[PDB]
Amino acid sequence: EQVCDVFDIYAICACCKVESNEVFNNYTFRGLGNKGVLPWKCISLDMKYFRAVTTYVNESKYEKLKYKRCKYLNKNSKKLQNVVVMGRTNWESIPKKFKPLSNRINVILSRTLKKEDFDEDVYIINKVEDLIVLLGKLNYYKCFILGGSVVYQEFLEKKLIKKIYFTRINSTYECDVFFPEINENEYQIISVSDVYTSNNTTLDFIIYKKTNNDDEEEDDFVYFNFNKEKEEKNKNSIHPNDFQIYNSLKYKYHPEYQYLNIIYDIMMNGNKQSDRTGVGVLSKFGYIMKFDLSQYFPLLTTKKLFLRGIIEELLWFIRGETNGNTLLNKNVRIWEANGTREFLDNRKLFHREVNDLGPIYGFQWRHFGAEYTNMYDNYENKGVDQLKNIINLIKNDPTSRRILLCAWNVKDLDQMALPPCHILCQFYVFDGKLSCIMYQRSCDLGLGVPFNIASYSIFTHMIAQVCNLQPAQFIHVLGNAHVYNNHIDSLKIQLNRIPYPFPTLKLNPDIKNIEDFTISDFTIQNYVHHEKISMD
Amino acid sequence: QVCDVFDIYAICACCKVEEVFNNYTFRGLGNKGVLPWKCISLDMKYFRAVTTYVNESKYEKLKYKRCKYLKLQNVVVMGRTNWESIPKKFKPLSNRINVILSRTLKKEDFDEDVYIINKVEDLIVLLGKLNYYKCFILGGSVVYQEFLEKKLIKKIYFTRINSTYECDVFFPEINENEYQIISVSDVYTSNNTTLDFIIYKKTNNDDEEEDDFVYFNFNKEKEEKNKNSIHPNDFQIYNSLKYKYHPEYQYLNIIYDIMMNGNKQSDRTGVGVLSKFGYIMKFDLSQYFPLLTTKKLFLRGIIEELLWFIRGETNGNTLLNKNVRIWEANGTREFLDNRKLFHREVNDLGPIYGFQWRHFGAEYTNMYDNYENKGVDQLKNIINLIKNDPTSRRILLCAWNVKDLDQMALPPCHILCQFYVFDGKLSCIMYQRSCDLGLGVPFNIASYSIFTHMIAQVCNLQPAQFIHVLGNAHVYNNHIDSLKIQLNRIPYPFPTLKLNPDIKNIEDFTISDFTIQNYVHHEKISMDM
Ligand SMILES: NC(=O)C1=CN([C@@H]2O[C@H](COP(=O)(O)OP(=O)(O)OC[C@H]3O[C@@H](n4cnc5c(N)ncnc54)[C@H](OP(=O)(O)O)[C@@H]3O)[C@@H](O)[C@H]2O)C=CC1
Ligand SMILES: NC(=O)C1=CN([C@@H]2O[C@H](COP(=O)(O)OP(=O)(O)OC[C@H]3O[C@@H](n4cnc5c(N)ncnc54)[C@H](OP(=O)(O)O)[C@@H]3O)[C@@H](O)[C@H]2O)C=CC1
Ligand SMILES: CC1(C)N=C(N)N=C(N)N1OCCCN(Cc1ccccc1)c1ccc(Cl)cc1
Ligand SMILES: CC1(C)N=C(N)N=C(N)N1OCCCN(Cc1ccccc1)c1ccc(Cl)cc1
Ligand SMILES: O=c1ccn([C@H]2C[C@H](O)[C@@H](COP(=O)(O)O)O2)c(=O)[nH]1
Ligand SMILES: O=c1ccn([C@H]2C[C@H](O)[C@@H](COP(=O)(O)O)O2)c(=O)[nH]1
């Protein structure tokens, strides 16, 4: 029966990255303070969250806490409040006008200072066993260790912390004090929040837990689930013990899990099929993922992704290009296999030159309906410039339900190296904000989708910028959602990884026409990721 | 009160008997001493799970409230006829404290180690003795009748058998103001009939990982910031349902979402809408036909529109001479002139659905030209892919021809279909760019559900899921009062579609090959004024 379960002693902290190819682990976020204050100016969303955790109380759950604490000890007002506990330097960093922390029982550890050194209404204690004494004598909901790196150190080495409410600030600052390295045998992460932007930085909230190493309408649920097939004669021959970490998290709110949960769904429930190659897949039909581009760039973190190649693909599209050599000469090999003599001949394109990919995305975006000749032709003022038209509808008719860019030209399919997977983009504008749906007919979950999420997220930012709009939601509709069999083992590794706060994307702000972007106009700041996974 | 105190529940299954609909549609209980239907086996299964199930760590709180009033099994209570109607092999219903109502036959008469009672009241005492989880009235018309009169029923566990059967005995009209529905299950096919499971209730006139939930909601919308200017009050029946598992809730929940969180915008026509972006509804065509039951929908017009598309027509008059007027407004001199189609004959709708489906890339001329073997017959093609190459990820039927949008009376709402085949079953996704949730979507669901069945049948496949992906989803501001009325109606179990099984060419359907079966619906709603 451990002290920290009876007295409900939690730690809450926020850690940035410090000035240290780069390896990343959970020690990456470890920077606590600098010269006796915080390393960052304001991160107001961290304060709002801090406020919410340290001030939240539930009177109904108090009676069971009181009984519990009175039991363990062999045994005023009633306006229930939490206790907070501060190193003295912690306490001397707090602006005067906020002391003591409102609606919280403030406790400060000091040797140099005694109660007569304070005006405030704070409990002063010499020592830790003095907090345990006080907590046995107070009516309080929960006790939060607000730190000082010294306070954090002594509280974990005494195994007095039940959980750590740990905030990952996904930027770097100068630090002189650090949070101790959390022992993974002693603490495991059980919950990871959504990812937000506050004060020009992304952040998320994770919870580490100390490791053990009317209720009529409760029953209606079980009646109503009477037909359910899964007794667990595993539909698909993937095992539980393999996703031990994935399955052990309670709150999986990081948006990366929108993509990770579909791979779980395809693996646990997919239909076994033998696609065009013979490879074999598990497949499902119909999914939506939504990413909040105002809060992050959804580059997956559970594996390393490089975006030079897909950014140069998006610029190639926008220029209207179909010349596979242009990508090959920038050492981008995305379309190399689809432009071989063999691949083209096998597509019955016997009169198509090597790397002439025919009327693919770029052609359809700038010239839909023009007769395709060859990758070198001047197609100016031929066919519909869809791209130009959709920028025009966003600018001048934002409320239009007809702002779509369509790659799927039915007449041209057989003349393309292969029919496009990104069928269409629709756009939606409300209150100065651009959202985008892309519908993908065919979705390689292990290899393709992660880049696809990136391409269309970058594209949405570009259309938003050139239209004087802010980006909102990139919405990804997956039709035929498949995991290739020989990706499965890699995907089992990736799923047992815990996402890191997303990075951000900065477009050079001077670019104002969609045509005027170059590779140097794109910056991915603060990409924290697990190491690369070769999907085979 | 007795019933809340003693956990006295009725379980029944009521078919329709041999025009306007209400809950008392579903009354048929029995016929000639047996049930009115041969064997509906999803219901027999439900009836087990419900009447066996008991919770270990909860009878503590009923040892409480029943004896604070004055392995553990369940009590069941059946009349003699209800007891005799049972075959011999299942008596006394296994794992259950069997019991009977009988003024006549006693325990020395009857077979195994049941219980008997002779007064309705005499039950009260027997329960006051026994150790039991919950008490179920399996009934007979007569047993049910006198238990509802005497106000002894906490909850009714009522199966809606959605077919018609000869009946001699019935269930009591369920007293509308004395009971209300608190839960409604998924819809199911079983033994060639749809059925759902609703729950009537009596009206009255490791919990740390729970606080973590509140912390993670720290940045949510509060009450002033649950955006919009509709009320809680007005959707009280919608809001009172705990379990909303009937698939119509996929449509209703989107209306609720748009009303409550929708962005106020002022579209094209100066009209006003609440708008969201990106939804996905999925309907199990193998289990029901998703024709909205919270109001009356008619399908002849949208079935004719579908046949019209399949024939490749663009001629608005063909529809107008069958009094299908879906496209009338889009064919007027005025509407064509405002689309800058000054040189388009009235009701010449241009290269719309039909033309793209059967002639994609052909130069449109007029609605009367012969276009045989011109452009890409996507419809013939997607059918040949399903039959020759079902694992293809290229089975798309696309109406959004970018070359032709300006020539169209208007661009299509229904951008494309994509098909999926697994294990001789056909699913269809339709991506809808523009979604009027009040008028359009209800019809749009039916159109593409029917289409899926048509494509499945000419391909010798069983239809599986219709998946409706909404892009710009909007409620017209002046549909709001109508939809509020609609949200507070409990869906009925869906109907079924019978296609004439002889039709094996998509081109060979006629209006008489389409039959809707057992359509039970709440009344017509004018969506406007
Ligand atoms: N990023 C974050 O989440 C947080 C960052 N911070 C930052 O942390 C830094 C301050 O931390 P750090 O320098 O360790 O200092 P601390 O806040 O941990 O202050 C340590 C002081 O607390 C007293 N103390 C600690 N333990 C005891 C004990 N057991 N008994 C008696 N006194 C005790 C001593 O006071 P005395 O010296 O008078 O005897 C000690 O000098 C600042 O930069 C602050 O802004 C603070 C909290 C959270
Ligand atoms: N749809 C459904 O879910 C169900 C349908 N059924 C159907 O219902 C039909 C038969 O039931 P219904 O006509 O009621 O017959 P019941 O099964 O209810 O049996 C009636 C008998 O129960 C006894 N009884 C009733 N009230 C009292 C009382 N107040 N005090 C003492 N005894 C009482 C009498 O038996 P006695 O003769 O001993 O005096 C009465 O004749 C059949 O078709 C059966 O299959 C049955 C169950 C479920
Ligand atoms: C605030 C912070 C960094 N965030 C999390 N998640 N966990 C913590 N332990 N941190 O809190 C430090 C507590 C002291 N603090 C630090 C502070 C804030 C601003 C400027 C200097 C110091 C503070 C100041 C004012 C109020 Cl109202 C509440 C807490
Ligand atoms: C069974 C039925 C119709 N279904 C629901 N949902 N609710 C009821 N109250 N009904 O229960 C009647 C009990 C008699 N019966 C039904 C029956 C069976 C065959 C012929 C006539 C009646 C029966 C037989 C075997 C078992 Cl395991 C359980 C119930
Ligand atoms: O941007 C792309 C391009 C291709 N694919 C995958 C999907 C399929 O695995 C394959 C395309 O093959 P078909 O679906 O065209 O047969 O490539 C993607 O996931 N994303
Ligand atoms: O099959 C259809 C056709 C139209 N609409 C609705 C969507 C809009 O309310 C309007 C179409 O006008 P635009 O979206 O093209 O502006 O009609 C539908 O919901 N379904």
Automatic annotation (TrEMBL), chain A:
Binding site for NADP(+) 1: 14, 32, 36-37, 88-90, 110-112, 148-151, 154
PROSITE patterns: DHFR_1, DHFR_2, THYMIDYLATE_SYNTHASE
Positions contributing to NADPH binding: 14, 32, 34, 36-37, 88-90, 110-112, 127, 148-151, 154
Reactions catalysed, as given in the entry: dUMP + (6R)-5,10-methylene-5,6,7,8-tetrahydrofolate = 7,8-dihydrofolate + dTMP; (6S)-5,6,7,8-tetrahydrofolate + NADP(+) = 7,8-dihydrofolate + NADPH + H(+)
Alphabetical UniProt keywords: Methyltransferase, Multifunctional enzyme, NADP, Nucleotide biosynthesis, Nucleotide-binding, One-carbon metabolism, Oxidoreductase, Transferase
Cellular component, GO annotation: cytosol; mitochondrion
Entry's Gene Ontology molecular function annotations: dihydrofolate reductase activity; nucleotide binding; thymidylate synthase activity
Entry's Gene Ontology BP terms: dTMP biosynthetic process; methylation; one-carbon metabolic process; tetrahydrofolate biosynthetic process
Keyword hit for Disulfide bond: no
Residues the entry annotates as binding dUMP: R276, R401, R402, C421, H422, Q440, R441, S442, D444, N452, H482, Y484
Domain annotation DHFR: ranges: 8-210
The keyword Methyltransferase is assigned to this record: yes
Assembly and binders: Homodimer.
Family listed: In the C-terminal section; belongs to the thymidylate synthase family. In the N-terminal section; belongs to the dihydrofolate reductase family.
Name the record gives this protein: Bifunctional dihydrofolate reductase-thymidylate synthase
Source organism: Plasmodium falciparum
Name of the encoding gene: DHFR-TS
UniProtKB/TrEMBL annotation, chain B:
HAMAP family, A to Z: Thymidy_synth_bact
Family: In the C-terminal section; belongs to the thymidylate synthase family.
Binding annotation for NADPH: 13, 29, 31, 33-34, 80-82, 102-104, 119, 140-143, 146
Reactions listed under catalytic activity: dUMP + (6R)-5,10-methylene-5,6,7,8-tetrahydrofolate = 7,8-dihydrofolate + dTMP; (6S)-5,6,7,8-tetrahydrofolate + NADP(+) = 7,8-dihydrofolate + NADPH + H(+)
Domain of life according to the entry: Eukaryota
Recorded GO CC terms: cytosol; mitochondrion
Binding site for NADP(+) 2: V34, R80, T81, N82, R103, G140, S141, V142, E146
Gene Ontology biological process terms from the UniProt entry: dTMP biosynthetic process; methylation; one-carbon metabolic process; tetrahydrofolate biosynthetic process
Keywords: Methyltransferase, Multifunctional enzyme, NADP, Nucleotide biosynthesis, Nucleotide-binding, One-carbon metabolism, Oxidoreductase, Transferase
Active-site feature positions: C413
InterPro entries assigned: DHFR-like_dom_sf, DHFR-TS, DHFR_CS, DHFR_dom, Thymidate_synth/dCMP_Mease, Thymidate_synth/dCMP_Mease_dom, Thymidate_synth/dCMP_Mease_sf, Thymidylate_synthase
Organism this protein belongs to: Plasmodium falciparum
Quaternary structure and partners: Homodimer.
Family annotation (SUPFAM superfamilies): Dihydrofolate reductase-like, Thymidylate synthase/dCMP hydroxymethylase
GO terms for MF: dihydrofolate reductase activity; nucleotide binding; thymidylate synthase activity
Name of the protein in its database record: Bifunctional dihydrofolate reductase-thymidylate synthase
Organism lineage string: Eukaryota, Sar, Alveolata, Apicomplexa, Aconoidasida
